[PDB]
Structure formats: C-alpha cells, structure tokens
Design a binder for this molecule. Structure first.
Ligand SMILES: O=C1C=C(O)C[C@H](c2ccc(C(F)(F)F)cc2)C1
Length: 133
C-alpha cells in the first residue's frame, strides 16, 4: 500500500518553468519546443514491490519499472542514458538521475486532488501539476 495515493491515470494541467529546466539539463532547441507542447498522461501502477510509471504523449511514450531504492537504467524522453534511483522520503517519491557527471532530481507528491511533479537541475525548478484523468 506504499504508493496507493499515487496509483492511477493522471493528466497534465499546468506547467511552469519547464523550458528553463530542460535548458539546464541540456535539451536541444527542437526537442524543447516539441516536448514543451505535450500534455502527457502519466499512468502509475504497482504490482507487489514493482512500481511502473508510464508517460504517454504526442511527443514520446516512456515507461519505467523499478523497486524503491534499487538503481536502474533509464532512457529519458530527451534520449539521455541515465542511472536512476527512486525512493520514498516522507511520502514523496524522490527520483535521482545521474549521467555524464551531472544529476537531476524529480519529486512526485500528492497535494489535495493533484499530483505535483517538481523537476530540479542545479538552481532551476519546474513545477508540473497533474489531475486525475
Ligand atoms: O514524470 C515526469 C512528469 C513530468 O511532467 C515531466 C518529467 C520529465 C522531465 C524531463 C524530461 C526531459 F525530456 F526533459 F528530460 C521529460 C519528462 C517526467
């Protein structure tokens, strides 16, 4: 029951500062423009200890499956090959991605009826708000 309140199908309803976050990460112009238009569906499910997070959009469909605390390989939507570890910290899913000596953290939290995603690269934060689909 670890992630019960995350499970479901969620739709993006607002984004702030995502272009600047992508620039800080190193995403190129064309990818930033097309990715920034997307209104993804995020689908979260749990089966035993395995959590799956799928993102479906016009830009790209992504899927990760993982066990908390156990590092895995991830190919991001912008085509980075990263090493990821996801943990639960006081009810917040904390996702760290490491590649080329760099790091970024994505936090996913339940707040009221929303799922709030905060993406941080050094000093730059982006907030992406989802509602139930
Ligand atoms: O779970 C998530 C929910 C979001 O709203 C966005 C996050 C994300 C960050 C970065 C990228 C990029 F392509 F920029 F790396 C793609 C997606 C992933």
């Amino acid at each position: 029951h670890m992630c019960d309140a995350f499970v479901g199908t969620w739709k993006l309803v607002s984004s702030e500062n995502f272009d600047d976050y992508m620039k800080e990460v190193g995403v190129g112009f064309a990818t930033r423009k097309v990715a920034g238009m997307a209104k993804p569906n995020m689908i979260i499910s749990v089966n035993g200890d395995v959590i799956t997070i799928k993102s479906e959009s016009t830009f790209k469909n992504t899927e990760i499956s993982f066990i908390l605390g156990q590092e895995f390989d991830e190919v991001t939507a912008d085509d980075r090959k990263v090493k990821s570890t996801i943990t639960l910290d006081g009810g917040v899913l904390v996702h760290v991605q490491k590649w080329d000596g760099k790091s970024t953290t994505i936090k996913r939290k339940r707040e009221d009826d929303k799922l709030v995603v905060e993406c941080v690269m050094k000093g730059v934060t982006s907030t992406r708000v989802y509602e139930r689909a």
